[PDB]
Write a protein that binds this ligand. Structure first.
Ligand SMILES: [Mg+2]
Lengths: 101, 258
């Protein structure tokens, strides 16, 4: 949207607790990147019906480091840039999905 | 502050290896282009810019290194165009910056040295993919070439060799630049590098796009739905390229010739 303040987007790779990929890679706007939006998104990509949604938590894999962040940040763009990922769209971000219930 | 370069020995062996790999493909592409191009004018000469993506997404091996496929394609296309002797061939690189790897006025790709010096400059590590800057610089380059030409009409063509991945908000930003190129009769053709050996889910044809409504329900789109380049082709195998690039240009010239 506006040049002066658009936050852009990144590409997400969803893997389950076995490490297996769950969906196609998907582009997500940083302005939408709440943990709850991403949970609804994963259930939609799996084609599950709206009342069938499994609530998910996500662990963030930091590219270029063997480092996983277990608590979802208030600002995902800032978290990634703090860890040296200056342009997240250039590299795919792996998210480990944790079914909550 | 100059850009990191491959070893020259590495670049020379790449050029020689790729030339051998692509020799029959270049011959097929040259034969087809001669018929397409050495009709419709060539009293006309062309100026062609091969614009190669130097960004680090080209190094992802979840997508089987698009940069490998792009440099093979570069050698194929540069050699096919060289035997035509119909105009000048230049090479631009782009990522965070835009650079001229080989000028329209530089030596022709008849020597291994000239090809190797180009491959040396591509390392696929730049931290962004600035396609808006690419188009601004390409338009400005070709416009200076026109002004030089008058003061002393070419057909000017840019071929973009890239995995085609930018943030989707950039698709709308590229549309006015493509209109500006078209107004100046610069033809822009995008060659999407999408290696067949990409892991499942990671092809450009598989990439999805999440749009959240006012209600917060996500609606799924496909990445290429809004891809702004009207003229492009998708390469999954090196061997795909001659047939598809020739078919695209043949069809475009059929239409512009009416
Ligand atoms: Mg890139």
């Amino acid at each position: 949207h506006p040049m002066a303040t658009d936050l852009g987007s990144f590409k997400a790779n969803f893997i389950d607790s076995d490490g297996n990929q769950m969906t196609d890679v998907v582009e997500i706007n940083f302005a939408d990147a709440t943990e709850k939006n991403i949970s609804n998104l994963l259930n939609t990509l799996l084609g599950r019906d709206r009342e069938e949604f499994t609530p998910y938590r996500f662990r963030i894999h930091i590219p270029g480091k063997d480092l996983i962040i277990d608590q979802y940040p208030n600002d995902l763009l800032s978290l990634l840039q703090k860890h040296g990922v200056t342009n997240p769209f250039e590299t795919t971000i792996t998210l480990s999905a944790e079914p909550q219930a | 502050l100059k850009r990191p370069l491959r070893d020259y020995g590495e670049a020379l062996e790449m050029w020689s290896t790729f030339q051998t790999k692509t020799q029959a493909l270049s011959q097929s592409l040259s034969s087809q282009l001669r018929l397409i191009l050495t009709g419709s004018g060539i009293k006309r000469a062309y100026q062609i810019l091969l614009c190669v993506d130097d960004s680090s997404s080209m190094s992802d091996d979840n997508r089987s290194t698009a940069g490998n496929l792009a440099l093979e394609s570069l050698v194929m296309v540069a050699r096919a165009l060289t035997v035509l002797e119909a105009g000048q061939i230049g090479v631009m690189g782009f990522g965070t910056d835009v650079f001229v790897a080989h000028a329209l006025t530089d030596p022709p790709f008849t020597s291994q040295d000239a090809g190797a010096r180009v491959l040396q400059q591509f390392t696929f590590r730049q931290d962004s993919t600035d396609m808006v800057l690419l188009l601004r610089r390409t338009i400005d380059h070709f416009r200076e070439a026109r002004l030089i030409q008058a003061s002393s009409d070419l057909w000017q063509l840019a071929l973009i060799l890239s995995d085609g991945l930018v943030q989707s908000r950039d698709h709308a930003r590229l549309r006015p630049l493509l209109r500006e190129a078209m107004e100046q009769r610069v033809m822009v053709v995008f060659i999407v590098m999408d290696d067949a050996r990409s892991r499942k889910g990671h092809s450009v044809l598989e990439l999805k796009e999440a749009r959240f409504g006012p209600d917060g329900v996500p609606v799924i789109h496909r990445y290429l739905d809004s891809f702004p380049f009207p003229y492009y082709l998708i390469v999954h195998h090196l061997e795909d390229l001659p047939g598809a690039l020739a078919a695209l240009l043949r069809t475009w010239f059929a239409e512009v010739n009416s």
